[PDB]
Structures are given as structure tokens and as C-alpha cells.
Design a binder for this molecule. Structure first.
Ligand code: PRO
Ligand SMILES: [Cl-]
Ligand SMILES: [Cl-]
Length: 221
């Protein structure tokens, strides 16, 4: 048991570091996008920035919304009638953060897919000029986790217990209790009766997220 605990802990730390280092490169691209837009926030300049291959190859789309409701998105897309960027979770979350942020999964207004967004406020010498966001699909996050490793699966859960990414998509945005009503695992401890442990992801901006490692117990050696 000491041996399995030591290994799950070590695997959790590995998986956690790597997803942190997958995310933080993508967080830099958005921050750089926001910084460059703050240079020249004319919508022509904005649109040429978002059309660049480093962004379009990395994200489903990236975009700028501002306090008047103006919205520029690339690749371009017809947004639903009455779409307002200011009421979307990426906008509200970047507004209330002095750093960049990452949203919990939500329903993309463009694709209708489930997505998360990296967003940060774009600031021109103290003044906000809007919020820049980039979108990653839930399926992308599942694939990025399931690529990161021996015995069970990794999933991602917020500190408050909300399951964010899980290879069982039915469990996405269920709380731990709602997903696991009989004997609920607790983040508060780092082992739970499958055996499950939680490893904090360090160094993300604005969020407190955990890697959960879930392994078939008796198969584990
Ligand atoms: O759904 C949203 O709010 C973001 C912005 C447009 C595309 N995805
Ligand atoms: Cl990559
Ligand atoms: Cl446009």
C-alpha cells in the first residue's frame, strides 16, 4: 500500500507538471495576443493578429470582445443572434482577474461543442481595451490527458470538486459527490476508496485545479 501510494503520488505529480506545461504555453500565446492587440486595437489590426497560424493552429478560434459588445473572431463565424461576449464566462472571468484565466467547460456559442477558454484582459497602459480569448475543445483536453500516461485514467477536477475533464464525458461538470454518490472521494485527502488520489496542478494562473488519478485497485501492483 505504501508502494502503490508512492507510485500514484509520483504519477500524479508527473501528469500534473506536464499538463501545466501543456497549458502554460497556450496561456502565453493568448497573453501575447492580448499584449499585441493593446498595441493596436483597431479591428483590422486585431483581425490580422487573430488570423495568424500560431493561433489558428493552436485554438479552435481566438477572439476579442469589448465593453461595447463588439466581437471579432478568427476563423470567422456567424455568432447566434443576440450573442454578447460580455456575458460569456471567459469575459467575466478575465475581467475579475488581474492575470489570465481558464474557464471551466461550457457550451461554445460558435460550434455548440463543449469547450474551455483561456482568456486575459487586454490593457493599454492601465486602461482595459477588451478581453482576448482562445478556445480548446473538451475532446482536445481529454486527448491531452489520456496521452499523459500506467494503470487507470487521469481526470481533471477543480479544488471545489467539480469534474472538469474526464474520459467519461457524462461526468464532465458533475461534482465529485454527484459523480460518485456512494463513497465520495474528497480532494481534502490524497487517497480515496478504483482508488483515486488528487495532485494539485501548480502554476496555473487564477485557478486551483487537481489531477485525479483513478486506477483499478486490485489490478494494481
Ligand atoms: O462561446 C464563447 O463565448 C466563445 C467566444 C466565441 C467562441 N467561443
Ligand atoms: Cl502541444
Ligand atoms: Cl470581422
Amino acid at each position: 500500500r505504501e508502494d502503490l501510494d508512492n507510485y500514484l503520488n509520483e504519477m500524479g505529480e508527473v501528469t500534473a507538471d506536464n499538463i501545466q506545461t501543456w497549458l502554460s504555453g497556450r496561456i502565453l500565446l493568448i497573453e501575447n495576443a492580448a499584449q499585441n492587440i493593446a498595441i493596436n486595437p483597431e479591428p483590422a489590426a486585431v483581425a490580422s493578429l487573430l488570423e495568424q497560424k500560431a493561433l489558428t493552429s493552436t485554438f479552435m478560434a481566438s477572439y476579442l470582445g469589448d465593453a461595447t459588445g463588439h466581437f471579432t473572431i478568427r476563423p470567422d463565424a456567424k455568432m447566434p443572434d443576440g450573442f454578447d461576449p460580455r456575458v460569456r464566462p471567459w469575459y467575466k472571468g478575465a475581467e475579475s482577474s488581474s492575470t489570465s484565466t481558464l474557464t471551466e467547460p461550457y457550451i461554445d456559442a460558435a460550434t455548440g461543442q463543449t469547450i474551455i477558454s483561456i482568456a486575459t484582459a487586454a490593457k493599454k497602459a492601465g486602461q482595459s481595451v477588451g478581453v482576448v480569448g482562445g478556445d480548446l475543445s473538451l475532446q482536445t483536453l481529454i486527448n491531452t490527458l489520456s496521452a499523459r500516461d500506467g494503470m487507470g485514467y487521469a481526470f481533471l477536477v477543480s479544488a471545489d470538486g467539480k469534474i472538469l475533464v474526464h474520459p467519461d464525458k457524462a461526468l464532465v461538470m458533475k461534482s465529485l459527490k454527484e459523480a460518485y454518490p456512494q463513497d465520495t472521494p474528497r480532494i481534502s485527502s490524497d487517497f480515496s476508496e478504483r482508488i483515486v488520489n488528487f495532485t494539485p496542478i501548480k502554476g496555473l494562473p487564477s485557478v486551483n485545479w487537481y489531477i485525479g488519478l483513478s486506477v483499478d485497485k486490485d489490478k494494481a501492483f
